[model samples]
Target chain A: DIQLTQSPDSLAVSLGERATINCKSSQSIFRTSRNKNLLNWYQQRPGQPPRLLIHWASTRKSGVPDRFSGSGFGTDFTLTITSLQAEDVAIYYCQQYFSPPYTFGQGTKLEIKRTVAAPSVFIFPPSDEQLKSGTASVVCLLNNFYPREAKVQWKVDNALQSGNSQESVTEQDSKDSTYSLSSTLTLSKADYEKHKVYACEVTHQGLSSPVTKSFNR
Target chain B: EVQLVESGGGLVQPGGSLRLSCSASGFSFNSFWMHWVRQVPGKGLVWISFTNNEGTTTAYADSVRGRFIISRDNAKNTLYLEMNNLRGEDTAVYYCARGDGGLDDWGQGTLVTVSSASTKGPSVFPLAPSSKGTAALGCLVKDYFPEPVTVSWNSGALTSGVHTFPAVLQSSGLYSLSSVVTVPSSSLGTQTYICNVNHKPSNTKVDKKVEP
Candidate 1:
């Protein structure tokens, strides 16, 4: 039954510099019984669902990068993005769970003042449902890549292949002020059965060498 | 193993009621608590309501207070969240989650862009005794999904002697469940009974009684 308010509707910070977002709840989130503040923080990339970044004020969720940290208790709290990366550019939100009707703060966007970062190629294979449908679609996840834009191409057996693919718009990850993108290729089940490999070639100015994620069909 | 799926997000008129259902599978529905959480567009997550595993009691968020309700239907392994007195601020995505303190597993959200009239209510029936000393008392709840509801007995007789039977799903995608209570000695008309159904969007109990 508390209201939450967040300040600095948006923020800007240089790459590797610190960025901070503040949230205040109308009621104290400190619970005497638990001896902990029940506030939570989340990061929301455009077009993707929000991911819990931190909970109980300061503890980070598993698999979240180390740069993202939270601190504060009672009615005041802060979410700090240390050494901001290009991928860390997104909206941050704070929530209070100390009481029922737990509410969230208006999101604060982390805009980039100046940025730099690179990419490592990651790809995933098709699921059973896709395999059963006689089609295989593979995704190339460009992680923590910078500049918010890049070139994604597919080469079949090392030969450039065009047409019939889906590419997501450049998405910024708030973790390190880096960018991320995904491109999917759909091939016939026959091609997949042949056990041929598709190599996703990624080119970015931040990368010394082109990144590639190869997946066997 | 556990799976939670929620649906029923749509438009509704102001002052209307909305009921969202959550269907779960793979684990004992009674061992874990199902809590409904919500996120308004451009906002953060908020707690809605929570129900115990056995489909018994529920606690609602103070915000929704008298306007919201949380309930469970165990026979079908489902949970329900109903909210009334809709407003523009009510537009949101609701997720059903299970965990302690914080949600561990979450169902894909059910988006509610608006609100409207409440779903249909329950229809009750008392089956005459086919045998010498036992009979059936049933409650048929309809068209409500995300399945949070409470069909309980209040009478001293049914409270102690009645038990819920399997819920029947209609071809129309609605759910109905019942109970059979064994009254004292023989004749069908000799006993009196009451069934209480707690559902929301219309926060009043639909009490159906079996009178001699």
Candidate 2:
């Protein structure tokens, strides 16, 4: 039986900020002749039957928010909510449509961390190909920042790790203070396989379970 | 929606018998199929068999096959299951279900127990103090179609050689039979043994390995 594994197990996102959940299938779920992928996303709230959000990997189910979209196919897929909403706090799951006796990923919980004047940045693990290349990098370019002194740190495998960093402050046309930061880490092939997490931890004073980007090659 | 309201509890002695019924309501008796499922306390459910309103049946599990029968009397809108060859493991909660493909409704389960005058008595068979190896084990009368039921066992380890026996009818409408076979005590602990019973089911036989 193919196994599905999800990352972050849980997360926290502010309203209007983009949120993403990654799902990987043990085997390809595409049927070439049928021109369809058999992957689906579901939202399960406490004491309620799971509601379908995305089916066939990319098609949003009826009545679902336009912010929710899915991409990727076969072995790797992504479910993204362009703009998170307060009412969207719930556990999300991904499942295969390829065969009977279907299986689901453990799950990821989305929560409202805090409200800020600046947009929150969400980082995700590089694609499988990027990881296979033996090294991957990411930079959070927070364009419109507030309270110029916001702090940023690099997190690997969910652990705070020492790495290179740089921050810059700028003023927007609307006269609001803005801040930006960049963190980089060079990972060996073994490091990528051993610790698959690469996240940019932001401390604006009111967030929970640090914002994270996780990957598994 | 259809419903199956089953009767409550039942008890039977080791050598006794039992029969339970599941009555159907709110559905056309002939439109669907009814099945019996057994679940020993704390154990998973086991499919016993399915019975149509007309009495046709099929069993998929081995232990409950042949020893039980499912029947229905449409005039009464009740389904009946009769089971014999009572054993301790057969004590369980039985439920009746209605389904065409997927189960639609289930009856509240009923618990059944097998009781006897004494829970523990003498061994079912009597062995001589010095008896060793492939001796014939006692035979059990499974069922009698029309004629008297009879069974026999060779008295030694089963590997020694070929053995034969004869039968005689007792006063109680049961027949008794016995046989002698060559048995080696050492071989008795390792080899397979057979217990053959001649009955209307065409002389059913069972083979089992002797436990060390």
Candidate 3:
């Protein structure tokens, strides 16, 4: 099995500056017969899944910006951001698919230098599919905050509901160093009729106080 | 924007088959890759299969390599998984997702239950191989149900080098197993080797023979 290790656990770069992350494989990823390196680079934005940037070591994925380039061969490789922009501040990861069990790097977190940002919150009602499961569900999205950690709570008719919700793991933004989070609350059809108000409240270090986003059914 | 809607989820008889479908829209279906992942009621996710839009890349997990056929109709913007010879262990919720590096868009998973029961008698076969000083013979029992069965050889129940494999579910919605017994090679050429299968549930007995 091959192991991939990415350098620089975290980096703070200024806008329009070059950003480079290095990955080292424990063994040769080069296939002598194909003369190709079995490496790929991925960029993951906050609240979204990862997107492939380059494949076969140096070949950029179709539609990817020219500014994003991959280099190197064999055991050593690099992912370079020619001119980092605000949207380029997401996390970067390197993966090797030379053989089974494919392996991935630990990931490198990228952000703008010393930037502090507040999260934007949005609430959504459950879809028909979700409601069909015999429960009323609500979703709250909290995105684009620095420092990454936050506390979230759910309220029904202004009463605390500590066990009625599930929160997603913290996610980092793709374009900046900020983070994103989400919480989902499940309510029984019986409880939905008894409660007139459903709310999601969040507290993060980037905010002066708690922020609440709600809707009445 | 991308959307995936899945269908073909319902109850099935043990040892039956089903075809699942994933219809795609709101995006160029031929430009993105698709994947099929399944999860049991109280278990973790298992990847079933994946295919690239260009028909260049198609892969499956070892467990479903032969019984599961995953393909696509790019013109119809749809993907499909044809699962056969299903058993209770295959019960799960199956999901379809559009993947680039990681899964970006996913369909609401559809639940499938491989339930219902049936019983049948065993079909026996003889498998014999030669060695230096010993004879290795195998008795294969197939297409039986309710799992309980017993095996015996011409000489006796069996002794050293006698190994019986656990009952395995087959795509035919049936169970199969094999028992191999080793005896002195000198006993070959003149003696006939026999394999006896007694299925209690079906009240059936079967025997197969192999001679040198």
Off by over 4 Å in 3: A1-27, A42-52, A89-114, A119-144, A153-161, A168-202, A209-217, B1-67, B70-212
Ranking by TM-score: 1, 3, 2
Model 3 per-residue lDDT tens digits across residues A1-217: 5678888978877778889899999999888886889888877554234567887898887788999999997789999997777778677888775764345687888776536677666565544433455656565666557766688888888999976665544433344545555565767777776877778888887789999977776
Q: Candidate 1, overall lDDT?
A: 0.67
Candidate 2: interface RMSD in Å?
32.3
The per-candidate TM-score of the B chain, in the order shown, comes to 0.52, 0.52, 0.54
TM-scores of the models, in the given order? 0.49, 0.31, 0.43
Error of 1 at A173 (Å): 7.4
Per-prediction DockQ scores?
Answer: 0.07, 0.01, 0.01
Deviation in Å, model 3, residue A134 alpha carbon: 12
Better of 2 and 3 by DockQ: 3
Candidate numbers sorted by DockQ from highest down: 1, 3, 2
Q: Where is the poorest 10-residue window by lDDT in model 2 chain A? A: A170-179
Query: In model 3 chain A, which range of ten residues has the least summed lDDT?
Result: A168-177
Number of the predicted model whose DockQ against the real structure is largest:
1
Model 2 alpha-carbon miss at residue B102, Å? 19
